[PDB]
């Protein structure tokens, strides 16, 4: 089907004979020449160790919350660690996190019984998932949890339990029987990383290095995790100082601001159009003519 335009016609028609006519066989598209990658020129390594390697976590009724911002996040350091009994992610894939880039990350941190790990998931029903700590049903993030019987057992009455992301401080407040003899009855530490995917300037981004920037040529691109393909160009689009992307009626990006120097780049899809094959019948000749629809002959 890629031998010649008549063969693409035969395949389009699902036929070995072709009658006289003009047949729309395919869309011609210029493929990307090279792949651009573009992230903020920032180098601070993110403080995930200050959350994960902390001496004591909080109680689940009174859970900690650390904002992570303005830093480079090598999530491989967490994801490759043998320490974690579960690492389940929602709205993102763990493999994609180093390819990806967020406005902020919120690291929630607390201690639970090993039975209760199941309740730290999107929209769940249960005593943790209402009276203590709940994830949104549309949560985008990772839940990272492990047994801590070697650290948090003694039992250790200093760990206690009673809307999405809600704190609330007779009262049903009670303490865990965490003893080293306890497996579901052990203490477990959990960190929940929540990812903020607003269209504001990204500040927590993977270690994936930026390339040089290319213009007036068809490229694949990635700006702050916004992947695409097109002829990047300079533009007269008067972005106001707060604006970061531009959009068209299809709700697709048609301009971006470069995160390393704040110029406004137009995005246009690479040269493309319908291909129509003009043929006499194959009973007459195997010769064909090709119409590249709406393109100028200089583009072909």
């Amino acid at each position: 089907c890629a031998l010649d335009p008549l063969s693409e016609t035969k395949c389009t028609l699902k036929s070995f004979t072709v009658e006289k006519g003009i047949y729309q066989t395919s869309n011609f598209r210029v493929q990307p020449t090279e792949s651009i990658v573009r992230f903020p020129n920032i180098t601070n390594l993110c403080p995930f160790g200050e959350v994960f390697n902390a001496t004591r976590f909080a109680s689940v009724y009174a859970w900690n919350r650390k904002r992570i911002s303005n830093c480079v996040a090598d999530y491989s350091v967490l994801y490759n660690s043998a320490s974690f009994s579960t690492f389940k992610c929602y709205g993102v894939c763990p493999t994609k996190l180093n390819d990806l880039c967020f406005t902020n990350v919120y690291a929630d941190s607390f201690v639970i019984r090993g039975d209760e790990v199941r309740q730290i998931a999107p929209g769940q029903t249960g005593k943790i998932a209402d009276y203590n700590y709940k994830l949104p049903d549309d949560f985008t993030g990772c839940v990272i949890a492990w047994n801590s019987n070697n650290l948090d057992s003694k039992g250790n009455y200093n760990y206690l339990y009673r809307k999405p992301f809600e704190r609330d401080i007779y009262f049903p407040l009670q303490s865990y029987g965490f003893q080293p003899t306890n497996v579901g009855y052990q203490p477990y530490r959990v960190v929940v990383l929540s990812f903020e995917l607003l269209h504001a300037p990204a500040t927590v981004c993977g270690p994936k290095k930026s390339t040089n920037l290319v213009k007036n040529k068809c490229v694949n691109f990635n700006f702050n995790g916004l992947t695409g393909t097109g002829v990047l160009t300079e533009s007269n689009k008067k972005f106001l100082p707060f604006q970061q992307f531009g959009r068209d009626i299809a709700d697709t990006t048609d301009a971006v601001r470069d995160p390393q120097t704040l110029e406004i780049l137009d995005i246009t899809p690479c040269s493309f159009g319908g291909v129509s094959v003009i043929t006499p019948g194959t009973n007459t000749s195997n010769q064909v003519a090709v119409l590249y629809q709406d393109v100028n002959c200089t583009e072909v």
């Binding site: 729309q24 869309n27 393909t229 319908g274």
Partner: protein
């Protein structure tokens, strides 16, 4: 005053549905000939104009 024709269109339904994603294009093949019979109907409309 009488209408005689209307704007001839073609919609490349693989580009409309999947936007040059190959990951989506491979899923769209599992719907079979829905895309070729959409192009066949629009081409019949266009030749009729």
């Amino acid at each position: 005053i009488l209408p005689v024709s209307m704007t001839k269109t073609s919609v490349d339904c693989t580009m409309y549905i999947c936007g040059d994603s190959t990951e989506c294009s491979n899923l769209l093949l599992q719907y079979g000939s829905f895309c070729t019979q959409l192009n066949r109907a629009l081409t019949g409309i266009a030749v009729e104009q």
